[PDB]
Symmetry: C2
Subunit: 305 residues, 2 copies
Amino acid sequence: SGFRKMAFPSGKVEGCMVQVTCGTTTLNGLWLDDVVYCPRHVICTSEDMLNPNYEDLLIRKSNHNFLVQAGNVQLRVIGHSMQNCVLKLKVDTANPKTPKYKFVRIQPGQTFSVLACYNGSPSGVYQCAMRPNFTIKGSFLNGSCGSVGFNIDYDCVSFCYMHHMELPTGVHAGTDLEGNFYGPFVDRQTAQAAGTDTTITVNVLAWLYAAVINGDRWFLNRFTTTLNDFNLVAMKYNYEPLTQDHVDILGPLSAQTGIAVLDMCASLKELLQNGMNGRTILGSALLEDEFTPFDVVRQCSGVTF
Amino acid sequence: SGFRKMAFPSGKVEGCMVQVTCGTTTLNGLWLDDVVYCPRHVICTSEDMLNPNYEDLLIRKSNHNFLVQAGNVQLRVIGHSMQNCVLKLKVDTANPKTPKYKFVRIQPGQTFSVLACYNGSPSGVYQCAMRPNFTIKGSFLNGSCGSVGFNIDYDCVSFCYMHHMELPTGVHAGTDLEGNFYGPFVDRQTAQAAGTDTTITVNVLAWLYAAVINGDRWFLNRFTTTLNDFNLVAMKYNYEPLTQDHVDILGPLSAQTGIAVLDMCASLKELLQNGMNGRTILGSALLEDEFTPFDVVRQCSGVTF
Ligand SMILES: [Cl-]
């Protein structure tokens, strides 16, 4: 029993964590086959970051200006290129430990695991989620850029994130592994605006579905509701509008528990209106929306990757 | 910035996760050099678990009855032995990926990371803590026995836990890697009693110290206190009594923040007496005691293992 914030096993991605240094700025990289993917603001100086002309700055750099080291071995950088907001550094060697992998642009609301790294050296792992406003609330210090997010399905590591910056709000922003920023964010140390975040409704209902499976059943009520009436309570509380596709995604869970989705929506409706009353569901005095219905089926199924 | 529940990089321990099967019961193992350490209730049947005579049961087993497989390769079990509540199975081979390691019996209150495994296949990782009553609140399903807890310091993997059973309370119990159960628990499917747990005080004060470093400063007050008066508020709320050694351990943090320990104890004292008032500290509406003062210095220092 028990529901905890679980993260995918990090070993496969650890082997690909390298260190890239251009000038004084040193950040992390990801070595898959003969390319080392790193954030492109490695080429900026201390006075370039408010508005860098990344093109001209890179035109001054050559291959030998980039210093890639996969731990203690140094890699001969034989090509350099810029895709969007990342640098793709061809190298003479292919990572012997290159996992079977795929690059993916996850949809807002889907969860992944971060291997927070500093100087190419893995430090630890934790599960973060792409918020509706394309931000992630994680744990990053200066030198964490390049730390990639990822999922693991059976044997494939589907990389989906790379940390780039910390926003004024305290949350963080990154790109996919093609360099396209999640959200409206650009890699320049400017005051950027993270939109009014919302609360992933399909994920709070799935974490409540988990509590029922793990003993916490006090929220379950006699009431019911309509999909539109819970969406009127939702809009008040700045929750994500619920669709029929959410109901169908939460179906497998709704059957293992025998509770209808719209019934669980009444129990949710009534937790928002009357609060928590000092009680705890699955160990939290708040409502948790960082578990997708797959994370709930997975931990309550004993999946192995 | 940001404080998240981080877990050590799992790669080094993943290579040592194997599968041990005796009869129908299949559980996980840990392969370090030429020994495979697994929970000893692998030898029990469906009608042996209320009160197994582990000695006689093992006397009927031989080496060939144990079926160890490190993934797809099968290991020739050449010796079998019982240390306390674990089985130590000598094998013809040494794990090529055996990390530098040490077995450790952690003290109640210290934290470690669990690589929850099923059928020898790592599933995911998360940070758990040995509660004052020698229980751990984690995420375990049938088949998770053998999942080892561990810490990583620079390069050494200091294994400290192995999951054995789920208690009636819903929490879980395990052993060190010598087989000695943490707590009063015996490996027999009986109704066992987890003592009245307490709240790790040195760890709530360190997670509050973290909030100050990461922006949350509303709990900080003008009041102060004595070490004995906060221990009288502590005993009321079933918190762990605070000692001078706790104060000295929280010293490095108290200096980076400029706030005295006993001052933070007044802010704590006043969160217990008047509650949280619906506010959140570092993202939780409760008080978190699963971060040791090292976990706070580590995440706010960018350590790399
Ligand atoms: Cl909480």
